[PDB]
């Protein structure tokens, strides 16, 4: 799905054969714009002392914004990998330490791989992964993460493994990333490859089953499409319900790296995507126009607008804009 137009030789003349387009899936974190509320959450002014996950008595390491070796800015969450961002310990008790990490794009992006949020110190006991398709106007929840789902969000604890091919669009609350005494103790996952596995398979070789369903169902196609992302932190890693008061330095948020991989929505009309004037935009082909190739270019309004389909494999149907009738 790399080529747009190819030199074709027909019985009557020689024109171009139009086929389905798709850009290369790359590390998207290079194109986002991070937003934090409260903006004063990043520790440094004044310098604070923190405690690592290992021991509660392990309080020697400190955070200071003035010194680059001790500074932890939000830029480190998208740094090539370990460097990590840190938030100020909740000194204001019992005020809930709520942090919102808005990952803005200002462009429609279809996800291809799992959203991996690798933490540095503890996994939050209350967390919501949110999405937006209307450029940050409204917010739709992707998945909820908590220690006790029935108490924290009033939902029954489920898992992606427990879901089915008919219940792919279902929003679930998982307890898989609650405990900190197993392997992957600092990793929070949003299973996208496992959600594709219901159609494609465990090996992900039969892509034809996945491609076919994406062309027919609009809701399934919209589920993986995002314009914005949000990490809604509610309660930090405390472990036990009874939280310490004398030592508030033990509790805070720390993220090592965020893995957001995907493709920009071209509606199967473009392969080239230019990051012009701090914004990623599609280099429209098949006589299309707009930011996501959602509109027909004027003078090419013969047949109504329709996005390209993957079927048949490999040369998919382009559904190009034909010239207007005189």
């Amino acid at each position: 799905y790399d080529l747009c137009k190819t030199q074709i030789y027909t019985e009557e003349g020689k024109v171009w054969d139009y086929m389905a387009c798709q850009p290369e899936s790359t590390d998207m974190t290079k194109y986002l714009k991070v937003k934090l509320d409260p903006p004063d959450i990043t520790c440094g002014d004044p310098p604070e002392t923190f405690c690592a996950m290992g021991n509660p008595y392990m309080c020697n390491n400190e955070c200071d914004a003035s010194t680059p070796e001790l500074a932890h800015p939000p830029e480190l969450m998208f740094d090539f990998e370990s460097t990590f961002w840190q938030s100020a310990t909740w000194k204001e008790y019992p005020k809930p330490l709520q942090v919102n990490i808005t990952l803005s794009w200002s462009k429609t992006i279809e996800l291809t791989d799992n959203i991996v949020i690798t933490f540095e110190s503890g996994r939050p006991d209350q967390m919501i992964l949110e999405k937006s398709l209307d450029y940050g106007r409204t917010w739709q929840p992707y998945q909820y993460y908590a220690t006790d789902c029935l108490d924290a969000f009033h939902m029954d604890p489920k898992s992606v493994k427990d879901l089915s091919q008919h219940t792919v669009l279902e929003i679930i609350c998982t307890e898989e990333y609650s405990t900190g005494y197993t392997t992957n103790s600092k990793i929070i996952h949003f299973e996208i490859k496992d959600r594709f596995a219901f159609f494609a398979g465990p090996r992900l070789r039969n892509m034809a089953s996945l491609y076919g369903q994406l062309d027919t169902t609009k809701k399934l196609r919209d589920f993986f499409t995002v314009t914005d992302l949000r990490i809604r932190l509610l309660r930090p890693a405390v472990g036990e319900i009874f939280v310490d008061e004398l030592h508030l330095a033990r509790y805070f948020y720390a993220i090592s790296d965020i893995k957001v991989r995907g493709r920009c929505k071209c509606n199967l009309h473009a392969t080239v995507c230019v990051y012009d004037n701090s914004k990623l935009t599609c280099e429209c082909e098949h006589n299309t126009t707009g930011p996501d190739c959602g509109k027909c270019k004027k003078n090419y309004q013969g047949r109504p607008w329709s996005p390209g389909s993957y079927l048949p494999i490999p040369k998919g149907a382009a559904n190009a804009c034909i010239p207007s009738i005189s």
Partner: protein
């Protein structure tokens, strides 16, 4: 006064930061005035003899997240004021015996996430001043000695988390021990013989230790215990009045366990209701039966009083011979306690000296005496009610 070009020093030279910088050898040029030396995230492998000789005021030494595989004998020589020694996330295959020798101020020592194979006899004996010790995340651990914690009579905190141990090691020389962490291990079942000698212990952590059953009178030796964490385990039921000898106990964590809610879990339900205040430590929920699954703990359903299988029969016996007062219960869950005509109450948990009570509930006598004659009453207790059985003993 001296400052290395690689390291970022502070004014008056007390804190020497060497974090993020790549170093293969120990940096030379550290001032005597230094109280804190941070060498986190480095590539250092060998700690040479007299590397911290001139540093007499240094209290905290951070050698964490490095490639340290071997530590020499005279490596920690010259450090008189050293209190905290960070050695977590390294390449240490064995604990260096010649390293931790002459340290009088050392109170804290972290050694987690290291490929330590074996802990030998008389380890940490040369440093008895140690109050906190962390030997966590030892994935490559295969041997633990009997006298491994010998000499540590002043130690209060110990972390043996994620060491994948099946049985509790010899923690007897740790008299002053208050906090113990045995979370994330492969502990099969808690037996009464375990945890003995830990009279001063207050906090116990058994989070996700793969525990399936807790036997009767298991936590009886931990008298001064205040908090127990048994979260993320495969526990279905607990023995009746287990936390009864534990007078100083106040907080119990029992969440994320497949609890089989019935008549036998009523004593634990009332513990959360009255003994626990407005703030409850755990948010435990049922797994079986499916009609009660996911509901919070805390007598609507039908329950019955304890039933005695065989009542204690009146018997005529002479002095010298062995005497027995048979009293068996319908279920193994019920706690049996005998009441002597003297006034004293005898339980199963107590030491088997002359007069004893076994698992079945039978009162066994080794030698019959004159003072033993009178009226014996057996009280079988259950989470719902209590039932008594009278018996008369004849001594000739």
């Amino acid at each position: 006064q001296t400052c290395p070009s690689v390291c970022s020093c502070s004014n008056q030279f007390s804190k020497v930061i060497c974090v993020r910088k790549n170093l293969r050898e120990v940096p030379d040029g550290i001032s005597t005035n230094t109280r804190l030396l941070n060498l986190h995230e480095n590539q250092i492998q060998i700690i040479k003899v007299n590397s911290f000789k001139h540093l007499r005021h240094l209290e905290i030494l951070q050698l964490s997240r490095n490639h340290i595989r071997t530590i020499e004998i005279g490596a920690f020589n010259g450090l008189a004021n050293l209190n905290t020694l960070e050695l977590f996330d390294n390449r240490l295959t064995t604990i260096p015996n010649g390293a931790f020798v002459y340290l009088s101020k050392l109170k804290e020592l972290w050694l987690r996430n290291n490929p330590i194979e074996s802990i030998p006899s008389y380890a940490f004996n040369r440093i008895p001043s140690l109050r906190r010790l962390d030997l966590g995340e030892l994935k490559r651990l295969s041997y633990i000695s009997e006298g491994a914690f010998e000499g540590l009579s002043n130690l209060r905190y110990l972390n043996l988390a994620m060491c994948n141990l099946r049985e509790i090691p010899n923690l007897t020389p740790l008299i002053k021990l208050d906090e113990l962490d045995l979370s994330g291990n492969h502990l099969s079942a808690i037996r009464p013989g375990s945890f003995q000698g830990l009279m001063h212990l207050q906090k116990l952590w058994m989070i996700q230790s793969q525990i399936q059953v807790i036997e009767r009178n298991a936590f009886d030796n931990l008298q001064s215990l205040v908090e127990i964490n048994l979260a993320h385990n495969n526990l279905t039921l607990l023995p009746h009045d287990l936390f009864t000898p534990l007078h100083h106990l106040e907080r119990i964590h029992l969440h994320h366990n497949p609890w089989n809610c019935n008549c036998d879990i009523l004593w634990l339900s009332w513990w959360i209701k009255d003994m626990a205040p407005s703030n409850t430590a755990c948010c435990a929920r049922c797994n079986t039966p499916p009609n009660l699954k996911g509901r919070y703990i805390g007598n609507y359903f039908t329950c019955y009083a304890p039933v005695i299988v065989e009542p204690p029969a009146d018997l005529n016996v002479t002095e010298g011979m062995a005497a027995e007062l048979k009293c068996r219960a319908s279920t193994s869950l019920t706690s049996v306690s005998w009441i002597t005509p003297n006034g004293t109450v005898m339980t199963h948990g107590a030491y088997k000296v002359r007069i004893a009570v076994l698992s079945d509930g039978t009162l066994n006598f080794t030698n019959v005496t004159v003072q033993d004659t009178g009226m014996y009453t057996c009280m079988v207790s259950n989470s719902v009610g209590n039932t008594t059985a009278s018996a008369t003993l004849n001594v000739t």
